[PDB]
Write an enzyme that holds these catalytic residues in place. Structure first.
Site, short mmCIF file in Angstrom:
data_model
loop_
_atom_site.label_atom_id
_atom_site.label_comp_id
_atom_site.label_asym_id
_atom_site.label_seq_id
_atom_site.Cartn_x
_atom_site.Cartn_y
_atom_site.Cartn_z
N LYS A 131 -0.98 -11.86 36.76
CA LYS A 131 -1.77 -10.62 36.37
C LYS A 131 -3.30 -10.62 36.25
O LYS A 131 -3.89 -9.83 35.74
CB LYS A 131 -1.49 -10.58 34.60
N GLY A 132 -3.83 -11.66 36.67
CA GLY A 132 -5.15 -12.03 36.88
C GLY A 132 -5.90 -11.04 37.67
O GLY A 132 -7.16 -10.86 37.22
N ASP B 189 -7.32 -15.83 32.44
CA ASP B 189 -6.76 -16.44 31.40
C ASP B 189 -6.67 -17.75 31.19
O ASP B 189 -7.02 -18.60 32.03
CB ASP B 189 -5.44 -15.60 31.02
N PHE C 20 -14.37 -24.73 33.75
CA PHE C 20 -13.31 -24.10 33.30
C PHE C 20 -13.96 -22.66 32.91
O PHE C 20 -14.42 -22.47 31.71
CB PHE C 20 -13.03 -24.98 32.12
N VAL C 21 -13.40 -21.65 33.70
CA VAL C 21 -13.69 -20.13 33.33
C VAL C 21 -12.57 -19.45 33.02
O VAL C 21 -11.24 -19.80 33.25
CB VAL C 21 -14.49 -19.60 34.55
N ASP D 101 -9.64 -21.23 44.63
CA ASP D 101 -10.10 -22.66 44.39
C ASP D 101 -9.33 -23.55 45.28
O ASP D 101 -10.09 -23.79 46.53
CB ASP D 101 -9.87 -22.94 42.90
N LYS E 14 -14.18 -20.74 44.00
CA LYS E 14 -14.74 -22.23 43.84
C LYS E 14 -14.61 -23.25 45.31
O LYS E 14 -13.48 -23.64 45.19
CB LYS E 14 -14.16 -22.82 42.74
N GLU F 143 -7.86 -10.89 44.97
CA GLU F 143 -7.80 -11.98 44.25
C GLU F 143 -8.71 -12.07 43.22
O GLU F 143 -9.90 -11.71 43.22
CB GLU F 143 -7.81 -13.32 45.04
N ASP F 144 -8.33 -12.82 41.91
CA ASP F 144 -9.16 -12.96 40.81
C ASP F 144 -9.92 -14.22 41.11
O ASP F 144 -11.26 -14.20 40.96
CB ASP F 144 -8.38 -13.26 39.61
N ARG G 76 -8.36 -12.57 29.07
CA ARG G 76 -8.44 -11.91 30.20
C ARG G 76 -9.31 -10.63 29.85
O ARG G 76 -9.91 -10.01 31.14
CB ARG G 76 -6.99 -11.39 30.54
CA LIG Z 1 -4.51 -15.27 41.39
#
Ligand SMILES: [Ca+2]
Ligand SMILES: [Ca+2]
Ligand SMILES: [Ca+2]
Ligand SMILES: [Ca+2]
Ligand SMILES: [Ca+2]
Ligand SMILES: [Ca+2]
Ligand SMILES: [Ca+2]
Ligand SMILES: [Ca+2]
Lengths: 184, 184, 184, 184
Positions: free
Chosen positions: B49-50, B165, B158-159, B109, B137, B105-106, B171
């Site tokens: 859901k990001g 979320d 840590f975001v 990493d 990242k 994408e949100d 969110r």
């Molecule tokens: Ca994602």
């Protein structure tokens, strides 16, 4: 010259609700919900994919520690049209029992499918269940549904935009517009 | 006094990317994509859901007749962590064969799950497949993935926010912020 | 008299494989698999809904501590026909990485969808991946698939039974029969 | 010697219901259902994955033009235990409105989840809705459910077999047996 005019905006006959009007209404509704749900366990549940734009905007306008989830549904055929009954393709993952659920809708017209989803969610014992929609076509009602929060009331015109599609297109329009009959 | 300070903003140590910066970057990326995909059959595919906030904003910033779809996935356990392999809970409905797909994408990493989804989508024969993320990242990379469009590069903090979320919360923050360690 | 003759058996032109032949073949294949997979981590994966009868019978004929799982898929349209590409409606829940997977099929003809599912499962890193089908129509092949275990080879006749349907009907026939053209 | 004794049968303390008893009961129930549903639009709906063995056997024992479908569900957590509420992972595809649905179960004990699924299916307006289970543990009841067809009534022992698992194992036992406590 057979060149094209690709912008989705070219397929719109008239703009019913502007991007700015939508933005202001989302801010308004969010401030109201922030007040009403203080101390509550707010879970916003939207029905994909039409609810994506309103869900994104409304959630960011609510200054509360809420959670978001979605339902993806499909039709059973010549049954969903008169009863609003739908098949669940993606159910919500969050356990809503004892929580305060707010259904977030893109548009409400007949209210048939909404009434059906409402009953399904009530079956999961949420503490409270309310409904919020950015658009409403009151003249289209075929069932009794209470809309707790409503952005705009509009006539029964063929609209697209702000998440609302026509054959998967036009969801990305930043406004609510009337689609030219030549496209449908 | 045992009163609370409910705003999700109170749990943020620092704002890495402001709402305005996000808005401007989304406009920028959308204008670029509008140019690059003219004449193409654009399908934006996001992972729930990001990706909801970025999908909503980016799509509305693209002046093209695009379609939107989503994937909902889950972990198989102590396997998704090192291989990026995931289970499909909700597959995309649009037939992407011969189409120009842009994964939205949100955050990227390790790139493990993204690489896995990329291979899965390639298996459906799209004409082209690209990737766009609002956050990256780079130091976290564990696989080779090409990011065609990137909003912001950030350190491995840590975001949360703008769709990202922590236990389903945050969110709805309109910015990207660093979460206070006391919350995690 | 307009009375009916409801038995699904009345719609069958000829029986290609009897219930007893199926029972004996299932016992045979199961004894073979019991020997071949001793010491292995056997996971039987079938594609719903056609594989249900064979999965039930074959599994009970295998004297090993195996696990069972399923995949439910759907077509993307005029694409699954020539490429075998399918949409995942229900993915398997068991983590198959490092396990010995045996795909259990009802019938193999073109091999297109089977080849596609095979590649998808291989992507999840199983230790081994094999295929077992109760029925095979070799003349229909359009792709190269290795069938490790095969019950019966049959000509390309219009068949139903033992899980194989025609418009959702006939799966409950205890034999493999040729459907009368009047029904299709 | 550290050799193993792999047969799932070695983990069974006692056989409560033999393969032959199951076979005879399935034949019996099927003949009854064949009589009762003549002229009806029979749809057998089973809950995966435990119902697979009984669904296969029962359906083949019913001499009627029936259809088969399935539901795959999951728990929401510390909620499904006391309310029977479940999440839908795979919904049935067949439109059951106006049809005669027979829920096919592996075992009924508390009846909580069954009652919940019953209400969900009733919401789709079937002409009739009945329940058939191969096993029933009457002493475990926590809700009022009417079992129209029942194979065997058994005490509340820890059982596996004929589709019923323990950590995904033992579904392939051809009988209903009591699992040795050392395994659980
Ligand atoms: Ca994602
Ligand atoms: Ca146009
Ligand atoms: Ca809607
Ligand atoms: Ca706080
Ligand atoms: Ca007939
Ligand atoms: Ca098959
Ligand atoms: Ca043992
Ligand atoms: Ca069950």
């Amino acid at each position: 010259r057979g060149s094209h005019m690709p912008s989705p905006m070219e397929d719109i006959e008239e703009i019913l609700i502007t991007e700015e009007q939508l933005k202001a209404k989302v801010k308004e509704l969010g401030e109201m919900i922030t007040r009403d749900y203080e101390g509550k366990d707010l879970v916003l549940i939207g029905v994909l994919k039409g609810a994506i734009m309103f869900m994104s905007g409304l959630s960011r306008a609510i200054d509360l520690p809420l959670s978001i989830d979605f339902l993806a549904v499909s039709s059973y055929g010549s049954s969903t049209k008169s009863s609003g009954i739908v098949k669940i393709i993606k159910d919500h993952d969050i356990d809503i029992e004892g929580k305060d659920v707010l259904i977030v809708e893109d548009i409400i017209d007949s209210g048939l499918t909404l009434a059906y989803l409402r009953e399904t969610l009530l079956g999961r014992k949420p503490r409270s269940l309310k409904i919020c929609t950015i658009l409403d076509k009151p003249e289209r009602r075929e069932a009794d549904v209470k809309v707790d929060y409503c952005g705009f009331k509009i006539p029964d015109k063929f609209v697209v935009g702000y998440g609302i599609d026509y054959a998967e297109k036009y969801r990305n329009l930043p406004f609510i517009g009337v689609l030219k009959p030549e496209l449908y």
